[PDB]
PDB file of C-alpha atoms in Angstrom:
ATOM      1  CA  UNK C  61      43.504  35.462 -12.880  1.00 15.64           C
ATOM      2  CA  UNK C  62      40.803  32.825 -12.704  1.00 14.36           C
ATOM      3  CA  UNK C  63      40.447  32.267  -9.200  1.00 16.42           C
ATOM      4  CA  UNK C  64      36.619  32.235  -7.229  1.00 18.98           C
ATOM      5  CA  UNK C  65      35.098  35.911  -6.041  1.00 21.09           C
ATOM      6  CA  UNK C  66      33.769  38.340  -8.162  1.00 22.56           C
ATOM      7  CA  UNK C  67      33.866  42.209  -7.287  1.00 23.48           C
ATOM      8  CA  UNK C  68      32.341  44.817  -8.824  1.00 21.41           C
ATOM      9  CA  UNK C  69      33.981  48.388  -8.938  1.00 22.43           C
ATOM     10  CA  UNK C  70      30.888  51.294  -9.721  1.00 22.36           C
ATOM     11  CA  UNK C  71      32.556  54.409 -10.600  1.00 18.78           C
ATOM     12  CA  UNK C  72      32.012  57.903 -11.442  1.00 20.16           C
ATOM     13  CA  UNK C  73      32.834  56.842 -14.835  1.00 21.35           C
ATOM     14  CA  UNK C  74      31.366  52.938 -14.871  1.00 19.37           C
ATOM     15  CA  UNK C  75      31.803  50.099 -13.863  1.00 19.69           C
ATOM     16  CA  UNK C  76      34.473  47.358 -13.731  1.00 21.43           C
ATOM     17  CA  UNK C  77      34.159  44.017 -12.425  1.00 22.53           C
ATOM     18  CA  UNK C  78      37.065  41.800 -11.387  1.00 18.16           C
ATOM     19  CA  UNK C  79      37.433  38.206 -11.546  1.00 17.66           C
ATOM     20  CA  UNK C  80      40.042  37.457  -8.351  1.00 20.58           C
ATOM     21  CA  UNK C  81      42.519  33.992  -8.102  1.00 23.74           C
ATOM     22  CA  UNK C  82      42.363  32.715  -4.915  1.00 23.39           C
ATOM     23  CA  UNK C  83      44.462  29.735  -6.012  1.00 23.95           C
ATOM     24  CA  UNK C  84      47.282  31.826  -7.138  1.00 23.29           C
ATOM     25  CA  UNK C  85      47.280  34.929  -4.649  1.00 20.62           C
ATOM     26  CA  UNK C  86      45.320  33.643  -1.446  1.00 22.63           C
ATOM     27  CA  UNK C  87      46.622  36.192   0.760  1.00 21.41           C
ATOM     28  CA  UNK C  88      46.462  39.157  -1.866  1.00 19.68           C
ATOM     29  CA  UNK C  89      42.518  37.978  -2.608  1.00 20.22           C
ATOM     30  CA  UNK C  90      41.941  37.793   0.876  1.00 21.01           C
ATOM     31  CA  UNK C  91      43.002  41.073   1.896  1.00 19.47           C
ATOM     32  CA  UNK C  92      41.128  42.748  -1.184  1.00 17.73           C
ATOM     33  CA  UNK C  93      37.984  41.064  -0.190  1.00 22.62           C
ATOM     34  CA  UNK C  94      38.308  42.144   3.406  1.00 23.22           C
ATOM     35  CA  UNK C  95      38.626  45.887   2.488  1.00 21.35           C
ATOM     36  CA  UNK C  96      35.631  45.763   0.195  1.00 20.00           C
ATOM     37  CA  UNK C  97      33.790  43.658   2.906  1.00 18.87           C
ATOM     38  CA  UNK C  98      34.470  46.481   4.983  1.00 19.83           C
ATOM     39  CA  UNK C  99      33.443  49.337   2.889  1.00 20.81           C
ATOM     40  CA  UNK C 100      36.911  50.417   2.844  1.00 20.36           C
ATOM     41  CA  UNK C 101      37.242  51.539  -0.677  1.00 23.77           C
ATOM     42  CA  UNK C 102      33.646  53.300  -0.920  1.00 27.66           C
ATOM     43  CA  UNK C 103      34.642  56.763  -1.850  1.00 29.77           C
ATOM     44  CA  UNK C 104      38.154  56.016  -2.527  1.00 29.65           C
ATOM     45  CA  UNK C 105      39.722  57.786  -6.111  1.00 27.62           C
ATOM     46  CA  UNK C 106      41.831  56.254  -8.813  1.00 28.47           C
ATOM     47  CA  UNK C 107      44.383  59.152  -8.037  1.00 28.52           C
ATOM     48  CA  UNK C 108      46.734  58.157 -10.632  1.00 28.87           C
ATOM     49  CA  UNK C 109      46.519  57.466 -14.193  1.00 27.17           C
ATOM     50  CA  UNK C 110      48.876  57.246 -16.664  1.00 28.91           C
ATOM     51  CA  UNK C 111      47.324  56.388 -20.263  1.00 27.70           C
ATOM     52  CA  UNK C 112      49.246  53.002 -22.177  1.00 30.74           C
ATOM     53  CA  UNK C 113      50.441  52.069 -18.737  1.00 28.71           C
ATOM     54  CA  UNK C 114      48.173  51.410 -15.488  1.00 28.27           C
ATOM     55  CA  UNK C 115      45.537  52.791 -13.493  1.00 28.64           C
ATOM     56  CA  UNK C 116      45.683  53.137  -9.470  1.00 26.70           C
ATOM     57  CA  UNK C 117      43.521  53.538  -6.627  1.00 23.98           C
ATOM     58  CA  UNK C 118      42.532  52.426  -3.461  1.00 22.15           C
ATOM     59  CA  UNK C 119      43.961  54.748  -1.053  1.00 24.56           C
ATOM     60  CA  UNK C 120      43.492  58.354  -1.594  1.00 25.72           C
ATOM     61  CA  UNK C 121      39.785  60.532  -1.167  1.00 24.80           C
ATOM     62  CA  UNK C 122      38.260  62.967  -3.265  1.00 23.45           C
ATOM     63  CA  UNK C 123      40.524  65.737  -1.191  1.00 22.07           C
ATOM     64  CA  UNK C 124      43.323  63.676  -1.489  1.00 21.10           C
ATOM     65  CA  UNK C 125      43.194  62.643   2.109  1.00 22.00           C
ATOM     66  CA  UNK C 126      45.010  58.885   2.659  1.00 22.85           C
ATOM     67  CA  UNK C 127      43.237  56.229   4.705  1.00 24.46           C
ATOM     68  CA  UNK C 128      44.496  54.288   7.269  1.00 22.42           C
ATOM     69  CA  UNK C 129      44.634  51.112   6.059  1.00 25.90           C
ATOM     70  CA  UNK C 130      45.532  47.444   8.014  1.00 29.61           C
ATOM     71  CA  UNK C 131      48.928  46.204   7.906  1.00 28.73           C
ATOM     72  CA  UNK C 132      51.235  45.637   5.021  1.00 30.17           C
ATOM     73  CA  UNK C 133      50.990  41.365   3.630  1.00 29.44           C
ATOM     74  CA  UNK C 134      53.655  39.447   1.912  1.00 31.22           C
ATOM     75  CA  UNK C 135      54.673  39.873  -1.694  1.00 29.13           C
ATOM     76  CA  UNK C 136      52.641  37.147  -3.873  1.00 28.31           C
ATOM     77  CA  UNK C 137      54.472  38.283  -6.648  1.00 30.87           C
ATOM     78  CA  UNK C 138      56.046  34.544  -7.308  1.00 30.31           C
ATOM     79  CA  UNK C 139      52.830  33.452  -8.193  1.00 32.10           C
ATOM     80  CA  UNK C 140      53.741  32.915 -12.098  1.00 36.35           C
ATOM     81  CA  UNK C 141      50.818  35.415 -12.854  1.00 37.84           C
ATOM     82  CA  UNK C 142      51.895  38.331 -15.091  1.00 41.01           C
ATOM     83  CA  UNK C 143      51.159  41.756 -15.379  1.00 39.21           C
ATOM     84  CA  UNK C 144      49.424  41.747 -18.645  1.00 39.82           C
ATOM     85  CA  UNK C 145      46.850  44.420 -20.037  1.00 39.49           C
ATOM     86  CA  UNK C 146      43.438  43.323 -17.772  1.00 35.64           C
ATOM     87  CA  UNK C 147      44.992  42.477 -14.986  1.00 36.18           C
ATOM     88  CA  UNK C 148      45.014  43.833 -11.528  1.00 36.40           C
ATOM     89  CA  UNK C 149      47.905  43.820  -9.276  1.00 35.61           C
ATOM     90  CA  UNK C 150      49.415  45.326  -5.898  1.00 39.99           C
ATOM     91  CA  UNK C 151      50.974  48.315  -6.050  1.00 38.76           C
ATOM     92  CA  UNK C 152      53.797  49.182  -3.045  1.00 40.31           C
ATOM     93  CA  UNK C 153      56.133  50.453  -1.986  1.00 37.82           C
ATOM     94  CA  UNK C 154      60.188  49.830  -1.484  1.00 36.84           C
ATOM     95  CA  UNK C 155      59.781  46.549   0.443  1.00 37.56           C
ATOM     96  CA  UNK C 156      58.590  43.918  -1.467  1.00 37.00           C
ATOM     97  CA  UNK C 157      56.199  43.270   1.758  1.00 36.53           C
ATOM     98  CA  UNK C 158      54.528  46.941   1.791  1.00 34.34           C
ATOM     99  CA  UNK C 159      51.669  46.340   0.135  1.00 32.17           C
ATOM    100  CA  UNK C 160      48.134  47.210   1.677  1.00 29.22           C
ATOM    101  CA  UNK C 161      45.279  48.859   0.044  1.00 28.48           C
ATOM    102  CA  UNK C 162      46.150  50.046  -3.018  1.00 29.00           C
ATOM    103  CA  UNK C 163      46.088  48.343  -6.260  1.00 31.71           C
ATOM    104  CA  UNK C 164      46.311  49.130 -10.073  1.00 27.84           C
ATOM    105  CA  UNK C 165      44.566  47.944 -13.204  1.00 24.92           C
ATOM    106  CA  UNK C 166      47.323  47.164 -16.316  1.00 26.87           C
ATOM    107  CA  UNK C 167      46.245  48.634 -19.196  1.00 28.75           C
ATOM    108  CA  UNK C 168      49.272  47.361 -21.664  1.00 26.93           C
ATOM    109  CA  UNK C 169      51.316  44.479 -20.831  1.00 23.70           C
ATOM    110  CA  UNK C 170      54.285  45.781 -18.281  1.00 19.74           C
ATOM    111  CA  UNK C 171      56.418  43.366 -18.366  1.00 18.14           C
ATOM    112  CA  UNK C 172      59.261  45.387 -16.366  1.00 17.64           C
ATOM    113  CA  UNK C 173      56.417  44.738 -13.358  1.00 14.68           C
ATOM    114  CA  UNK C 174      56.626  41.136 -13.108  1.00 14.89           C
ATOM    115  CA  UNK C 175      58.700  38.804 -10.495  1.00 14.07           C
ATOM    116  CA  UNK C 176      62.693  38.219 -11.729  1.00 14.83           C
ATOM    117  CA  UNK C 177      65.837  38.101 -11.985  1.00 13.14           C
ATOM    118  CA  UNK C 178      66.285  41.961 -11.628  1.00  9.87           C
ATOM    119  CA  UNK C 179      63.369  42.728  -8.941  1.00 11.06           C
ATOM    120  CA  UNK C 180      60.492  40.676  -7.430  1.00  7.27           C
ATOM    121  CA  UNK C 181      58.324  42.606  -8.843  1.00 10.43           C
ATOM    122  CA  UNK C 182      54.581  43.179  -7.901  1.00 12.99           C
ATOM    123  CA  UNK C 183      51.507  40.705  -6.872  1.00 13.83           C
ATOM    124  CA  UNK C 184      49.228  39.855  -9.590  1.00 13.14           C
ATOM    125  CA  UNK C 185      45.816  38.496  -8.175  1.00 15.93           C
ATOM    126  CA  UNK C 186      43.337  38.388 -10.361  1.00 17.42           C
ATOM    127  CA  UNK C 187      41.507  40.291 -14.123  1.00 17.90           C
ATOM    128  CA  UNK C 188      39.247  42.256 -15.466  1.00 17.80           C
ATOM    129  CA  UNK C 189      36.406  40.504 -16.579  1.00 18.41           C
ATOM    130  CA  UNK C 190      34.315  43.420 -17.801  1.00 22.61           C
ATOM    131  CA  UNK C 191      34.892  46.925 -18.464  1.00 23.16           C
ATOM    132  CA  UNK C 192      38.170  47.351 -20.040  1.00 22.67           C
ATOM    133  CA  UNK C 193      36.639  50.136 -22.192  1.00 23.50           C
ATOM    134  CA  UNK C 194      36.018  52.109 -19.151  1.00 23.10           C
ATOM    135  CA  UNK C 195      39.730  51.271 -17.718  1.00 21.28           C
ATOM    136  CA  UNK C 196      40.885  52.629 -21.010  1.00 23.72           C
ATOM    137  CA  UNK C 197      38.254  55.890 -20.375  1.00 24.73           C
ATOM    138  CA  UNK C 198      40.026  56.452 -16.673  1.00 28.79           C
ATOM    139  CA  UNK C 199      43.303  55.978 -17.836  1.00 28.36           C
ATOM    140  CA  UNK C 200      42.820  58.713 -20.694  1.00 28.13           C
ATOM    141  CA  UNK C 201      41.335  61.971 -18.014  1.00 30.70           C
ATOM    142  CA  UNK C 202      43.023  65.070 -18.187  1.00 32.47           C
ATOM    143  CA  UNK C 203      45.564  65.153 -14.456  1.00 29.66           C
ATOM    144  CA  UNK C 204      47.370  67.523 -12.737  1.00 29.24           C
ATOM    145  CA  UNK C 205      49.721  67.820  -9.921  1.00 32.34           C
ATOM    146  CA  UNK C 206      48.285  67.732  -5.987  1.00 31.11           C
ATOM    147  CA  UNK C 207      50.982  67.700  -3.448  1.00 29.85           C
ATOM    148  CA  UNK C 208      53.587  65.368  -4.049  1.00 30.15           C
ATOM    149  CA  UNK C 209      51.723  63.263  -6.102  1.00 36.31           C
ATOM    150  CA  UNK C 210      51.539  63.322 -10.298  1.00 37.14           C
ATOM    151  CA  UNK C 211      48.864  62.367 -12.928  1.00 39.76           C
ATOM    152  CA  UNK C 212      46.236  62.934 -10.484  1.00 36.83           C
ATOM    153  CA  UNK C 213      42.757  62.977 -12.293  1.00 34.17           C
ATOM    154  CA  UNK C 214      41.623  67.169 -12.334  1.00 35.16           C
ATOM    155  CA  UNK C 215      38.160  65.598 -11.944  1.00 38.83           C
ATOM    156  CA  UNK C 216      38.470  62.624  -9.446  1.00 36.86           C
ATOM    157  CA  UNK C 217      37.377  59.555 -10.660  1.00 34.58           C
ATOM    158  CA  UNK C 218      35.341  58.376  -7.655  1.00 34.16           C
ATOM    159  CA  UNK C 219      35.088  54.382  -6.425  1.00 33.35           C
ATOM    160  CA  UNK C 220      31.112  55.008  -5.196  1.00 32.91           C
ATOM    161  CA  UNK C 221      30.772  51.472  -4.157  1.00 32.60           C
ATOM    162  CA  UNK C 222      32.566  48.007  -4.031  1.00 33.04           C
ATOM    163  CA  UNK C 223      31.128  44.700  -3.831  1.00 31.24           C
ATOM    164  CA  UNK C 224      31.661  41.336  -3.712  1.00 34.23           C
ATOM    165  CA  UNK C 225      29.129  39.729  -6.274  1.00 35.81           C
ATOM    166  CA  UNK C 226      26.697  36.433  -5.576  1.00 36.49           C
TER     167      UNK C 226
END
């Protein structure tokens, strides 16, 4: 939620910029900050979109090629924060600790994501502060199938440049 650093996302189809809560989700907001430190999600795709529900990105290229990423961090999840539309959360695997790179951007509220009774759900760290419109644009592409992966944009919506803002 409201938490410190500021990153802005430029993509192919504008640009987003993300207000991250390093009270709430230190380890999830420090990992983030170290990929886009990096340059680790320049040229990155949101390679997954499913409109009413969530965009995702952060690990795939333009061919669909995966980077290697660092290792997996703990589930954050148990934070209180909720996955509400305009937040941006952790997406994972099986193991509640499998998370690395990737991440999604809620564009309803998904309740059925969030830390209880049933699951322990996925990481919340931090919101959009500007650019919803152009979460809802991404979300709403035409996709198609690559591989093994679904609702994959037919033109790839490209992550040209991450940084964290003064």
């Amino acid at each position: 939620a409201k938490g410190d650093p500021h990153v802005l996302l430029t993509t192919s189809a504008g640009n987003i910029e993300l207000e991250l809560d390093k009270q709430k989700a230190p380890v999830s907001v420090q990992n983030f900050v170290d990929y886009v430190n990096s340059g680790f999600y320049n040229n990155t795709t949101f390679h997954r979109v499913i409109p009413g529900f969530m965009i995702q990105g952060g690990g795939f290229t333009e061919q669909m090629q995966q980077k290697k990423p660092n290792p997996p961090i703990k589930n954050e999840a148990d934070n209180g924060l909720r996955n509400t539309r305009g937040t941006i959360a952790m997406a994972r695997t099986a193991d509640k600790d499998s998370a690395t790179s990737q991440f999604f951007i809620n564009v309803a509220d998904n309740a059925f994501l969030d830390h209880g009774q049933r699951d322990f759900g996925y990481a919340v760290f931090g919101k959009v502060v500007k650019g919803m419109d152009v979460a809802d644009k991404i979300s709403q592409v035409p996709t198609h199938d690559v591989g093994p992966y679904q609702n994959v944009p037919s033109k790839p919506v490209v992550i040209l440049s991450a940084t964290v803002l003064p």
